[PDB]
Design a protein around this ligand. Sequence first.
Ligand code: SF4
Length: 83
Amino acid sequence: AAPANAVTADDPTAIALKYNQDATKSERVAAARPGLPPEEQHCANCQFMQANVGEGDWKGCQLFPGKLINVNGWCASWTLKAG
Ligand code: SF4
């Protein structure tokens, strides 16, 4: 069950970025974002995931202020967690 402030499928930014709370139901292979092979990409290893926001599998994303993403999700702004 998603938190009340989870990013949802009719959020206009979710649509533009092709966000899905489940990376296995995403277009990460088509996007081929750099940094890791696409099958290895999800929010937990993305630079914009905020691990001090949320709880459990539902964490912050800098690009979605006031909301929570799922650590197992993905979107086209995926960027390797480098620091
Ligand atoms: S920017 Fe990164 S953390 Fe935020 S939704 Fe997209 S893949 Fe997940």
